[PDB]
Structure formats: C-alpha cells, structure tokens
Ligand binder design. Structure first.
Ligand code: HEC
Ligand code: HEC
Ligand code: HEC
Ligand code: HEC
Ligand code: HEC
Ligand code: HEC
Ligand code: HEC
Ligand code: HEC
Ligand code: HEC
Ligand code: HEC
Ligand code: HEC
Ligand code: HEC
Ligand code: HEC
Ligand code: HEC
Ligand SMILES: O=N[O-]
Ligand SMILES: O=N[O-]
Ligand SMILES: [Ca+2]
Ligand SMILES: [Ca+2]
Lengths: 520, 520, 75, 74
C-alpha cells in the first residue's frame, strides 16, 4: 500500500511545484502517487538533485482515482479500421503513391486508429524503423490495454543488440526520429529539453539514436499531456506548440487576438541547475482546441532541405521540430519564413512540402470554431446519464458514435440521420475534389518525364515545379487533414480548387512546351 | 379561408379548361385552390387577358387534399448519399475525368439524390452556374421540405446585382441554360413557349439569361407534371417528350406500335391570342414509364456542334432542346439525324456525344417492360396497409427500401435477400464491364498524345476519333443510366462489350501507327 | 365522377349551413361530396323537406381529401 | 394539456407537412411526441417508469379495494 510522504518537506526545495500543487484540485493528492523520492530526499539539497527520484509516467497513476476517464480513453474503437493504407482506391488518397513518390510515406501511411495504439503504431509502421519493431504476433494488434500498459509489453525488436536505424524488410523506411515521439508519448518529459535542443540535463534530444530512445518509451498519450499533475489544471506540454503560441507570439488563435487573450497559454519553465530545461503551457481555460493541437497539427518532425539553396536541414536544426501554426493559405509563407521544404518529388524533382493532419489550423475560422465549439465538444463530449455523476468521455473518436452528445444537443432541429447526412454531404463533396485534385496532379506528374525526354528546358520544368509545390500543398492538406473537409468545408473547397487550378496551369505549360519541342 | 369563385363564369371564356375540369375527378375542385383571378375576371374579355390571373405552382396547392402523396414525395432518403461525385474510385465512373475531359461534367457530376432537391441541386452543382448559387449554409443541405417550399428559401446568390453566367470559384462551369430547368421544375409552365421557342407571350425561352430565369423558379417536380390540375388525369408537360412522341410520330413506345397505341399520348395545345403557345400530352393510361420519361431520358439541353461541319449549335437552335427518344443502338443514328454532337474530347479531339440518364430508352425491350411493368411498380409502388386506404407512394426511390411492394409481390418465389442478390448480380457484372470499358477507353485516350507527338497522320487520328465516338457512346450510356444495367442487363452487356471492342480497335490502330512512325 | 351542385340553390333554404359553410375551411367543398340532394331540391319547399336527400356518413367521404387523418384513424 | 397531446399528437416529420395523428392510442407507442417533447428532462424509459409507478400504485389500491369489497360482500 502507498504511504504518504511529507510534501511540506519537498516544498522546502520545490517552490514552483508548491505553488501549483497547493492551489489546485490535487492539493490533497500526495506525491507518493507519482513519485518515489525517498533516496532523493535523503541526498538532495536545494541546489543538488542527489539521487534522482522516480517519476511515474504510466496512465495507471491517474486511473486509480479517475477510472472513468482512463477507461474511456483506453477503449478500442474496433470500427476504426486498423492498418488501413490510405494509398488505395477505397481510402483517402487513391493516387497517394504517385503524388508522394520521394517521401517516406510512400512506404506506408495508414488511417489513424484509437489513441491507445499511437505509440505502438508509430513503432511498427513500415515507414518508421525499417520494420525493426513488430507486435509480438498478429493477435496483439487488438490489445489497446496492453499497448497503454507499455509498448514493449506488446512489441518485439528484431535486433535488441543494435541501435542503428536500418531496413529489416525491403519495403520499409527509417523516417522515425526523436521528434516524432513527442506526439506519441511524454514518458520522456523529464529527459528531453525544450524543443529537443542539446542540453546537459537531457538524456534525449533531436539528435539521439531514435532506436535507443524508442526502447525507453512505453506509454501513449500520457494523461498529464493535457492536465498538470500538480495543479490538475489544463495545460499543454508539447514544446513545438508552446514555441508557436508563446515564443513566436502567434497566440492560441492566431486569427483571433481576443480569443487568444481569453483562452491563452502561460509558459512555465523548469530549470536544471541554473539553466532553463523544459516548459509547459498552462491554459487559461480547459480549451481542448489547444490541448488537441499538441499533436493534431501540421509540423516538421523530420529533416528537410532549404528552399533557398536546397541544403540539408538535419535533426540538429531547430527547424526539425516545428509547428507552423498556419492555415493552408498561410502555410507557404510559414515554410518560406523558416526556409524549409520536406522532399523532392521522385518524378518531377519539385521541392515539396509534406503535410500532416492539420486539424487545429483547419478548424480556425470555421463556423463551429467561430461559435466557440472545440474539439472535445464533438470528439470527447460529456457523458449523458439518466442517473449519475457526469464526467468527460476520453474516448476521442468520431462523433458518429455519440451523435446525441456530440451534435444533436446543439442541433435540436436535426435527427441523427440528418446530422450524418450533413456530415456526408461535406465529406462526399470534399473527397470528390480531393480525387479530382489527384487526377490533375497525376496528369501533371506524368508529363514531367515526357517533357524532360522531349527536351523541355529546365526553366520550363522549374516553372512547373513551382506550380507543383502549390498544387501539392493545396491538395495534400486535405488528405492529411482527417475530417475530409468537415472541419472547414469552404476552406477545403477553395484550397482544392486552387490545387486543381495550379495543376491545370502546369499541365498546360508542359503540354505546350512538349508540343513546341516536337514541332521543332 | 379560401372563397370559391364562379367557375361557370370562367368557363364562358375557358372552354378547353371547362372540357377538362367538368369531366375529371377535379370537377368539384374550385379554381380558387390554384388561381387568383379576381382582377382578371373584372378586366378580361374572351379575346383579351386583361389583368393576368395568378396561378399557384407550389406543391402545397395539392398537399391540402393529397397530403399522403405530397408527404411521400417530399421525404428525404438519407441513404441516397448526397453530393457524391461519380468520378471517384468508389462511385459509378472511376475514370470519368479522363473520359469526359472537355465537357462541363468534369467540374462535378454527383449521384442523384431525392427528388425534393432537384431544383436546388441543379442550382448549386459546380458545373451549372459558376458557383453563383449556394445553400445559405451547409446545414440547409438536409432540408428537403425547405427546398420544396422554394429554392430561394434555402439558397443564396453570390451577386444578386448581376445576371450574367460567370465563374465565382475557379473550378466551376456555367453549363446551365434555360432548357435544363424544364427537368427540374415547371413553375414556368405558363411563361415558356413549347420547346422554348421565341414567343411574344413567353417571358422565358431557350435564349433567356439563365440566371434571371433561375431566380424566377422555386419548386421541384411540380405535382402537375404528371397530373393535369383540371382533369386530374395523367399527362406529361415536358415539351421535348411531347415533341419526340407526338410531333415526330415516334410514339410512346417506339419499338412497340401496339403498346404505343394502347398507351398513347394526345397533344393538347393552348394558345395565347391566335397563336399556339404551350402544350401538354394527355396519356391514355396512368403510364409512369412515360411520366418518368419527362426527365429520365437522354437529351440535348445545351449547345453543341454539328457532326457535318463542326459549326456551333447554340441555344437558339431547336436542337438545344431535344429528346432523342432512341435506345443506345439507335442513338448514333438519332444524333446523325439532327447532325449534332456535344463536345470535343480535350485529349483526343474526337467529336463526342454526352449521354444523360437514359432510363426510359434503356427500359424499352427489357424483360420487365415487355411484361407491362413500369417505373412506378418498382420505384413508387402502392403502399400496403393492414388497415387503410391504399394510395400510391410518391417517394420515387430505389426498390431496396420497399422490396415487398416493389419486387416480392410479383416474385413470390424469392425472399428479399434473393431479390437483392439478383439485382446485385446484374449491377456487379455491369459495373465490372463499365470499369473495363473505362480501362480500354483510357488506354486509347492516353495513346492520342503519344500518337500525335510521334507524327501519326491526321487520317489515322481521325479514324481513331471515329472509333472514340462509338467507344464513348457504348460506355457512357451505362454510367449515365442509373440502374447499373438492372433496367436492361443484356443491352448493357452488349453495349459495353461493343465499347471495349471499339476501344481495343482504336488502341491497336494507334499502337500500330505509333510503332510505324518510330520504325521510320 | 362527382359533379358539383349549385350550393347557392341549397343556401336559399339552408341559411344555417350557408353561414357555416361559406365562412369555414370547407367553403370550397361542394355539397356533392356528402349529399345527393337532386330529388330533394326538386321537391322541397322552404319549410318542408320533400324527398329526403342522401347524406353520406361514411368516413371515406372525408378520406379522399384527408387520407392521412383517415388512415391513422383506421389503423 | 389535453387528451390529444398524449393520445393523438402531431406527427413529427423530418420532411413533410405536419398533420395530427388520428390513431388515438396509448402514448407508449409515440413517447417522443406524446411526452418527451414536453418532458425534455426524461428519456423514454424514465417517462415509462413514471407512468408505471402511478399505474402500479393505483392498481395495487384497486386490488386492495376489491379485496375489502369482496370481504364485505361475503
Ligand atoms: C533538499 C531540497 C529538496 C528536497 C527536500 C526535495 N527535492 Fe526534489 N529536487 C531537488 C533538486 C535540487 C532537484 C533537481 C533540480 C535541478 O535539476 O536543478 C530536484 C528534482 C526533483 C524531481 C525531478 C527529477 C528529474 O527527473 O529531473 C522530482 C520529481 C522531485 N525532485 C520530487 C521531489 C519530491 C516528491 C520531494 C518530497 C518527497 C522532493 N523532491 C524533495 C531538491 C529537493
Ligand atoms: C489519489 C487520487 C488521485 C490521483 C492519483 C489523481 N487524481 Fe486527479 N483528481 C483527484 C481529486 C480528488 C480531484 C478533485 C475532484 C473534484 O474536486 O472535482 C482531481 C481532479 C482532477 C482533475 C480536474 C481538475 C480541475 O481543475 O477541474 C483532473 C484534470 C485530474 N484530476 C487529472 C489527474 C491526472 C492527469 C492524474 C494522473 C497524473 C490524476 N488526476 C491523478 C484525485 C486524484
Ligand atoms: C505534431 C505531432 C506529431 C508528430 C511529431 C508525429 N506524429 Fe504521427 N501522428 C500524429 C497524429 C495527430 C496522428 C493521427 C492523425 C493521422 O494519422 O492523420 C498520427 C498518426 C501516425 C501514425 C498512424 C497513421 C499512419 O500514418 O500510419 C503513425 C504510424 C505515425 N503517426 C508515425 C509517426 C512518425 C514515424 C513520426 C515522425 C517521422 C510521427 N508520427 C510524428 C501526430 C504526430
Ligand atoms: C488530449 C488532452 C487530454 C488528455 C491526454 C487527457 N484529458 Fe482528461 N480532460 C480533457 C478535457 C478536454 C477534459 C474536459 C475539460 C472541461 O471541459 O472542463 C478533461 C477532463 C478530465 C477530468 C475532469 C473530470 C471530467 O471528466 O470532466 C479528469 C479527472 C480527467 N480529464 C482525467 C484524465 C485522465 C485520467 C487522463 C488519462 C487517462 C486524461 N484525463 C487525459 C483532456 C484530456
Ligand atoms: C456546441 C454546439 C454545436 C455542436 C456540438 C455542433 N454544432 Fe454544428 N453548428 C453549431 C452552430 C452554432 C452552427 C452555426 C449555425 C448558424 O450560423 O446558423 C453550426 C453549423 C453547422 C454546420 C454548417 C457547417 C460549416 O462549417 O459551414 C454543419 C454541417 C453542422 N453544424 C453540423 C454539425 C455536426 C454534424 C455536429 C456533430 C459532429 C455538430 N454540428 C455539432 C453548433 C453546434
Ligand atoms: C371574359 C372572358 C374570361 C373570363 C370570364 C375568364 N377568363 Fe381567364 N383568360 C381569358 C383570356 C382571354 C386569357 C388569355 C388567353 C390568351 O392568352 O389568349 C385568359 C387567361 C387565363 C389564365 C392563364 C393566364 C396566364 O398566366 O397565361 C388563367 C389561369 C385563367 N385565365 C383563369 C381564369 C379563371 C380561374 C377564371 C374564372 C375565375 C377566368 N380565367 C375567367 C379570358 C377569360
Ligand atoms: C380541394 C381538394 C383538392 C385539391 C386542392 C387537389 N385535389 Fe386532386 N383530387 C381531389 C379529389 C376530391 C379527387 C377525387 C378523389 C377520388 O374520387 O378518388 C382528386 C383526385 C386526384 C387525382 C386522381 C385522379 C384520377 O383520375 O384518378 C390526382 C392524380 C390528383 N387529384 C392530383 C392533384 C393535383 C396534382 C393537385 C394539385 C395541382 C390536386 N389534385 C389538388 C381533391 C383535390
Ligand atoms: C421533373 C423531372 C423528373 C421527373 C418527372 C422524374 N424525375 Fe426522378 N429525378 C430527377 C432529378 C433531377 C433527380 C436528381 C435529384 C437530385 O439529385 O437532386 C432524380 C432522381 C431520381 C431518383 C433517385 C432518388 C434517390 O433517392 O436518390 C429516382 C429513383 C428517380 N429519380 C426515379 C424517378 C421515377 C421512377 C420517376 C417517374 C415516377 C421520376 N423519377 C420522374 C428528375 C425527374
Ligand atoms: C431531360 C431532363 C433533364 C435535363 C434537361 C436536365 N436534367 Fe439534370 N437531371 C435529370 C435527371 C433525371 C437527373 C437524376 C438522374 C441522374 O443524375 O443521372 C438529373 C440530375 C441532375 C443533377 C444531380 C446529379 C449531378 O449530376 O450532380 C444536377 C446537378 C443536374 N441534373 C443539373 C442539370 C443541368 C446543369 C442541366 C442543364 C445543363 C440539366 N440538369 C438538365 C434530368 C434532366
Ligand atoms: C413523375 C410523375 C408524378 C408526379 C410528379 C406526381 N405524381 Fe401523383 N401519381 C403518379 C403515378 C404514377 C400515380 C399512380 C397512378 C396509377 O397507378 O393509377 C399517381 C397517383 C396519384 C394520386 C391518385 C391516388 C394515388 O395515390 O394513387 C394522387 C392524388 C396523386 N398522385 C397526387 C400527387 C401529388 C399531390 C403530387 C405532388 C406532391 C404528385 N401526385 C406528383 C405520378 C406522379
Ligand atoms: C409487376 C410484376 C413484377 C415486378 C414488380 C418485378 N418483377 Fe421481376 N420479373 C417479372 C416478370 C413477369 C419477369 C419475367 C419472368 C419470366 O419470363 O420467367 C421478371 C424478370 C426478372 C428478372 C430477369 C431480368 C432481366 O431483365 O432479364 C430479374 C433479375 C427480376 N425480375 C428481378 C426483379 C426485381 C429485383 C424486382 C423489384 C425491383 C422485380 N423483378 C420486380 C415480374 C415482376
Ligand atoms: C373535396 C376535399 C375535402 C373533403 C371531401 C373534406 N375536406 Fe376537410 N378540408 C378540405 C380542405 C381544402 C381544407 C382546408 C385545408 C387548409 O386550408 O389547411 C379542409 C380542412 C379541414 C379541417 C381543418 C379545419 C380547420 O379549421 O383547421 C378539418 C378538421 C376537416 N377538413 C375535416 C373534414 C371532414 C371531417 C371531412 C368529412 C366529413 C372532410 N374534411 C372532407 C377538403 C376536404
Ligand atoms: C399527459 C398525457 C395524457 C393526457 C393529457 C391524457 N392521457 Fe389518457 N393516458 C395517458 C397515459 C400515460 C395512459 C396509460 C397508457 C399506458 O399505460 O399505456 C393513458 C391511458 C388512457 C386510456 C387507455 C389507453 C389504453 O390503451 O389502455 C384512455 C382511453 C385514455 N387515456 C383517454 C384519455 C382521455 C379521453 C383524455 C382527455 C380527457 C386523456 N386520456 C388525456 C396519458 C394522458
Ligand atoms: C375524437 C375527435 C376527432 C375525430 C372523430 C376526428 N378528428 Fe380530426 N382532429 C381532431 C383533433 C383533436 C385535431 C387536431 C386539432 C388541433 O390540434 O388543432 C384534428 C385535426 C384534423 C384535421 C386538421 C389537420 C390536422 O391533421 O391537424 C383534419 C383534416 C382532420 N382532423 C380530419 C379528420 C378525419 C378525416 C377524421 C375521420 C377519419 C377525423 N378528423 C376524425 C379530432 C378528431
Ligand atoms: O505521421 N505522424 O504525423
Ligand atoms: O444533368 N442533368 O441531366
Ligand atoms: Ca509537415
Ligand atoms: Ca445528351
């Protein structure tokens, strides 16, 4: 059984924690629930850690007093089809392989599934670790509870004796790097300096051997990612988000200074010795838009190249951990600001951005966001009980599973079927424009080899490559973004028509240039 | 409350209406239900209209005495997925964009949804009005009752101050013209001369500014499209249909002179001054095949070009409003008869027809049509009630929703699952042949640029373009036709194999010609 | 098929019905829907019925214009 | 509230002209229209439970009244 420790004694040296702990709703929650500091207290001074105390990062540390939130979080949504590759005719991006050729996502890019699996899925996807990690067997793919208990309880490493990223199967890539893990887990929250910068007190950083880092990480989506364990108050911990919102002064709602001020973030820094080491962002309100924006954003979490001179931007560069914190129409400028692109298309040679699930930046300015609706309202609503204590569902999933709570309480004028029909109208229309955007991008892409071989000039090819960047951005945003337009249907529409416009411009340019070469 | 008017006084001048009204089942229905003629009666003579009386075109005019028919009509089938683009891998025509390139349907071609929405969907589709019209917001897409009450109750116009067709968003077209509206509404039934010919008494015609016309139109599928409001007897009002069946003497069943005589149409013309102005076609029987053929046919409703010399056929030409009234194997001849094609393929340059939902002409000769089965039997059957007055469902939808009434009363040997399985066998087989037809058409289409660039002669390209017309017709009929072969499975099969045969012939022709050029 | 009768002819002797019928929401609903009064009209006086007109009491007399109400009633 | 509100309410249609149901019957068959539009605080099962609480209690007193009437009669 746990025995409480003298918190007051801890506070003689931990005044920041004292100020958080004594004021919030965890004021009565003893440190022993999440720390083992016996040897630490015997050896520390206010200026010397002494023995490092243990800090529990497991979600069970919270589940004893918050079982409903834990259980609704770990629940597996079996209808969220697993390991479902998006590059197929029946999924999000039928022409993804042609369009993304040159990028690691060509090796595999599945639809998301339940949050319980985020860390294990990161480890086993074919693009991440060369196929080094697998579930112990194909049955373990069901075990959300096991994955939450710890990735290494359900995974195997093909070669525990080596730590290098390499291919273990031919059609894999080794795209994983330490920055990725920040959106899968925060088990390393005390071992990783802000942004993943080199730091004397950081075991891990952007430049770590990601296989070694991986082995040290266990739990998905730690409960403390959104809730300070000391104050119990709302926060974020993701460095790239705090960087965009606070360091870069972009605010929580870059398009709304008022809402940014009402629903803002306060950066709190923790030191190691005299030196700033890590930071959190306390939220003014329990704002799930910003909590979910820790991961559901477009980001760099990878090396890339400079737009200016094409040179490598490696993991050591701060730009390898970056939240652009920009809507689709501001993204190109945001990428130009940091002088960065992700990859060169394998066929066209164009410098291209790689977009990832920009749900947060898409949601801005949408009708629901402007009306003060937030991610949680549709994806983790309060539970409705005929008789019971209300709590907030932590099963973060499509509102189709809980339409009464997620939609119909607000939309009293609709039945469930009507609300689903409204969702489907948007997704159907958006998906048709995605598919047409791909058709046109693919038509352009296929002209590049013809053009090159016909002797079309580099100047014309470069003009087309510039158009490719735009056509790509304005399409990929929407295959990357998970709502298929629902989060901002007018923006999706405008962007995808822009994509098609750009591709058509490039097609015309190339066909005319090819035709002129032939005519010579 | 309505006050009845002296119908006998109206009849002193309206002898045609008298003959219809006094004999049918609306003999007791007073004019005041659908007309406000007070000032008209005070000012008219038998030879001068005087003040124009109001004629109600709203469906509510019928709904007071026929609520069941109205309510079953306005019902939204939410399972008829809305705004679902057909040019996608999971819909009717995965290669539609490549095959239809050059035509306005490339901008958007969704699957049909419930009849309540036909007018609003016509107005908001991306190919029609440059994106000028939108639903007031994305919630209104559910509101079938609102759309029936009036399009402009649920839509907005991006620029009420201008009336020209232009693009408001880049990836739109302005294909709509006044002829379209004849298959969406008949609110203009008193304002449109037969065929949309210029007429002194017509506010609207084929050559009208379609945006201005659009604003004057409100209701979908007026109840009087199939039912004369005066006699209550069965009719059609669509000019192009009466033209094909009566003016051109093709008959209601061009392949069956006997059935054409038993189930015929009598053209009734109404004058303005001394001049024929508009017409209806009274049906000998309540023949839904012909009622539904007012819209579910292949047609011209658009400008095109002449096959003979390639010259423009504009909206002013009668050919812009035309029911070919021909099965797929008679269509090429029917198009040659009026010297007409729709568009030139953007890649091949071939003159091509554009086919639209030829359900009526497909149904002819099929086993059900030969057995006297009609559209209504499968798509708007009598309701079966344990205790009640039977009426005819007006929810015109797939028989999958009412298999007992639509199929199984006739097919006593089958369970519902068996009948669905028989439907799916046909649609699966037909769809696989559609997909193969597209594969071969696409293969041919892709050879055109290669051939042109290899220096293949215009004569060879023109031979291939002639084959393209055939390959296209024999394929597109079936993506345009909504039953995926069910309405005439053997015809679909024969046509689609013909398409593939033609495409293969063209592929061989082009590959050989390209190979010969290279060998030189 | 029903042929309408001249209600004004009825109203000349049927003031109470006239006052009810002309004002309410059945003002346009002809008497023939529920009455066959041909011989009555030929034989009545202002105070004597003459031949008795037929009056339909069946619910179907209302079901043709109010099918939904009738069908929900008979279920 | 009147008899029709619970026993022949207006029909609820996603798309349609409203009319008054003339099927005069227990509200258990149409609780959404007959009870729950007014009693927004209840689910159907809660409303049914409230009906049954009354009916059960009342029927129990009817049975007891009969018991005592029968005892007197005998
Ligand atoms: C004698 C002063 C003192 C005492 C008392 C004290 N601490 Fe610490 N603690 C420190 C110092 C110094 C550090 C290192 C801070 C730094 O890195 O500069 C530290 C670090 C920590 C850490 C972070 C270790 C890491 O992984 O980086 C935790 C957790 C912690 N203390 C918990 C506690 C708990 C719980 C108690 C009471 C049971 C306690 N401490 C009492 C001085 C103290
Ligand atoms: C020993 C029991 C216990 C432990 C362990 C525990 N909590 Fe709590 N938590 C509480 C209590 C008690 C409250 C206050 C309940 C109330 O006042 O409504 C609370 C409140 C909260 C709140 C609501 C705070 C607010 O301001 O509304 C959150 C969020 C929360 N805890 C998160 C967590 C997290 C995350 C963990 C794991 C790091 C955790 N708790 C571990 C007991 C616990
Ligand atoms: C900014 C936070 C963030 C970063 C950093 C991040 N991810 Fe993700 N990842 C997400 C989110 C959110 C999803 C779920 C939404 C989706 O898949 O579109 C996801 C989904 C996934 C999935 C499951 C779906 C799929 O694509 O197969 C895998 C695997 C994955 N990430 C691997 C990685 C890899 C490998 C890296 C580093 C190269 C990485 N992630 C970095 C946020 C992040
Ligand atoms: C992605 C951010 C996020 C994560 C991670 C998270 N929560 Fe929450 N949590 C929320 C939100 C949003 C609320 C509702 C806040 C509000 O509306 O007041 C909430 C509310 C709570 C509450 C307050 C009581 C309630 O249910 O409303 C508790 C306790 C809680 N969470 C516990 C946990 C536990 C335990 C975990 C780990 C299993 C967890 N949370 C993980 C976002 C998160
Ligand atoms: C907290 C209240 C609330 C929630 C929950 C809610 N809505 Fe809304 N929704 C609104 C409001 C307010 C509007 C704007 C209404 C207006 O301006 O007329 C709106 C607008 C919409 C629109 C127009 C969308 C656009 O971006 O233009 C759609 C579609 C819609 N809602 C569907 C849904 C769906 C489906 C759900 C559940 C996933 C949902 N709503 C949940 C309040 C809500
Ligand atoms: C004094 C003769 C006369 C009387 C009586 C008469 N009408 Fe007319 N009505 C006309 C004439 C003339 C026209 C125009 C025909 C033409 O265009 O040549 C016309 C046209 C119409 C139209 C078509 C208007 C249009 O939009 O084109 C309607 C409807 C109509 N009448 C209804 C009625 C009704 C109902 C009554 C009885 C309440 C009535 N009329 C009585 C002479 C008459
Ligand atoms: C004031 C009531 C009323 C109005 C308004 C009304 N109808 Fe009728 N309708 C009738 C009656 C009464 C019948 C005959 C019922 C019977 O005899 O079976 C009828 C019969 C019909 C029939 C059956 C005719 C046949 O020969 O079988 C059709 C079709 C019809 N109406 C269509 C309509 C249309 C379309 C409208 C709107 C333009 C309309 N009605 C408006 C009362 C009305
Ligand atoms: C006035 C022209 C017109 C008439 C007459 C007509 N239709 Fe339609 N039909 C349409 C249009 C337009 C649509 C597509 C509506 C939309 O997408 O908004 C459609 C759609 C349909 C659908 C698809 C409905 C769904 O659930 O998706 C069916 C089935 C159908 N029609 C059958 C029929 C039948 C059977 C008849 C004869 C009883 C008929 N139609 C008469 C124009 C017409
Ligand atoms: C001969 C009658 C007729 C003509 C004229 C007509 N339509 Fe249609 N339309 C239909 C029918 C029937 C459907 C439903 C069956 C289908 O979509 O295949 C339909 C469906 C539609 C739809 C919904 C499905 C889609 O394609 O997105 C739209 C939008 C539409 N039409 C627009 C137009 C436009 C624009 C015009 C004129 C350029 C036009 N229609 C002319 C009969 C017609
Ligand atoms: C596309 C043609 C079409 C349209 C438009 C149409 N109907 Fe019908 N209607 C039919 C057919 C077919 C029948 C059945 C005729 C038969 O089999 O005897 C029918 C029958 C009827 C009847 C006779 C009673 C019955 O139900 O069989 C009435 C009344 C009627 N319709 C009213 C309306 C109303 C009111 C509207 C407008 C909401 C409407 N109709 C629109 C085709 C149509
Ligand atoms: C009014 C009666 C009737 C209706 C309703 C009916 N059928 Fe038929 N069906 C027939 C008859 C008669 C045949 C020819 C039987 C024979 O010749 O042996 C037939 C033939 C068929 C065939 C062979 C088709 C072909 O074109 O070669 C299929 C499949 C079929 N029916 C399925 C259905 C389905 C599914 C439905 C409901 C959508 C349906 N039928 C509704 C009477 C009907
Ligand atoms: C020839 C068609 C017809 C006949 C037959 C008919 N009604 Fe009506 N009834 C109407 C019309 C038209 C209205 C007015 C609809 C409106 O304005 O909303 C009406 C309205 C009504 C109303 C609504 C009155 C109000 O003040 O709101 C009732 C109740 C009604 N009728 C009952 C009956 C009864 C009972 C019968 C049989 C004795 C009957 N009707 C027969 C056509 C008819
Ligand atoms: C506030 C709603 C309400 C009102 C108003 C109401 N009732 Fe009831 N009625 C009920 C309920 C609840 C029952 C029990 C039904 C059951 O248990 O299935 C009932 C039972 C009945 C029953 C027996 C039903 C059956 O199927 O056994 C009759 C008859 C009845 N009521 C008639 C009336 C009359 C007449 C009126 C107006 C004087 C009236 N009710 C008003 C709610 C209502
Ligand atoms: C026991 C009394 C009663 C009987 C008998 C009755 N009704 Fe009604 N009726 C009502 C009531 C109550 C309403 C709703 C009045 C209100 O709330 O405005 C109504 C409304 C109506 C309306 C107006 C439209 C609507 O639906 O609200 C019509 C039409 C009507 N009834 C027709 C009929 C028909 C036809 C019959 C015979 C099948 C019938 N009624 C028998 C009580 C009755
Ligand atoms: O691939 N994780 O965005
Ligand atoms: O596009 N209407 O056939
Ligand atoms: Ca990115
Ligand atoms: Ca056509």
């Amino acid at each position: 059984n746990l025995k409480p420790v003298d918190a007051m004694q801890c506070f003689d040296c931990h005044t920041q924690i004292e100020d958080m702990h004594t004021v919030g709703k965890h004021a009565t929650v003893n440190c022993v629930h999440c720390h083992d500091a016996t040897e630490h207290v015997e050896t520390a001074s206010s200026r010397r850690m002494g023995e490092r105390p243990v800090t529990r990062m497991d979600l069970e540390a919270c589940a004893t007093c918050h079982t409903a939130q834990f259980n609704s979080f770990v629940e597996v949504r079996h209808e969220s089809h697993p390991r479902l590759e998006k590059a197929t005719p029946t999924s999000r991006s039928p022409m993804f392989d042609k369009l993304i050729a040159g990028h690691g996502f060509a090796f595999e890019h599945a639809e998301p599934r339940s949050h319980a699996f985020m860390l294990v899925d990161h480890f086993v996807v074919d693009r991440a670790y060369g196929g080094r990690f697998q579930f112990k067997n194909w049955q373990k793919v069901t075990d959300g509870m096991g994955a939450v208990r710890g990735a290494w309880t359900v995974l195997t490493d093909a070669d525990p004796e080596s730590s290098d990223q390499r291919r273990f199967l031919s059609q894999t890539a080794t795209a994983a790097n330490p920055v990725c893990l920040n959106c899968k887990t925060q088990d390393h929250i005390l071992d990783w300096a802000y942004m993943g910068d080199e730091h004397e007190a950081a075991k891990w950083s952007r430049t770590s051997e990601v296989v070694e880092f991986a082995r040290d990480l266990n739990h998905p989506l730690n409960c403390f990612m959104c809730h300070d364990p000391h104050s119990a108050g709302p926060r974020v911990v993701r460095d790239g988000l705090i960087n965009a919102v606070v360091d870069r002064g972009l605010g929580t709602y870059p398009h709304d200074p008022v809402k940014s001020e009402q629903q803002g973030m306060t950066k709190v820094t923790f030191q190691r010795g005299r030196e700033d080491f890590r930071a959190i962002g306390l939220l003014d309100t329990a704002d799930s838009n910003v909590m979910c924006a820790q991961c559901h954003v477009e980001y760099n979490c990878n090396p890339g190249y400079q737009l200016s001179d094409g040179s490598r931007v490696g993991m050591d560069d701060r730009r390898a951990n970056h939240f652009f914190w920009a809507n689709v129409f501001d993204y190109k400028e945001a990428a130009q600001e940091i002088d960065f692109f992700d990859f060169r298309h394998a066929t066209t040679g164009a410098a291209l951005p790689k977009l990832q699930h920009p749900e947060a930046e898409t949601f801005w300015g949408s009708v629901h966001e402007r009306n003060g609706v937030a991610c949680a309202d549709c994806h983790m609503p309060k539970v409705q009980l005929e008789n019971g204590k209300v709590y907030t569902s932590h099963s973060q999933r499509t509102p189709r599973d809980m339409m009464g709570q997620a939609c119909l309480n607000c939309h009293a004028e609709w039945t469930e079927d009507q609300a689903l029909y409204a969702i489907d109208y948007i997704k159907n229309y958006t998906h048709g424009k995605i598919v047409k955007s791909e058709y046109w991008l693919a038509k352009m892409i296929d002209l590049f080899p013809v053009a090159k071989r016909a002797g079309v000039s580099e100047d014309v090819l470069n003009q087309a490559r510039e158009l490719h960047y735009d056509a790509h951005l304005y399409w990929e945003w929407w295959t990357a973004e998970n709502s298929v337009g629902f989060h901002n249907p007018d923006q999706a529409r405008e962007s995808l028509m822009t994509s098609i416009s750009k591709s058509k411009e490039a097609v015309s340019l190339l066909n005319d240039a090819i035709d002129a070469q032939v005519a010579v």
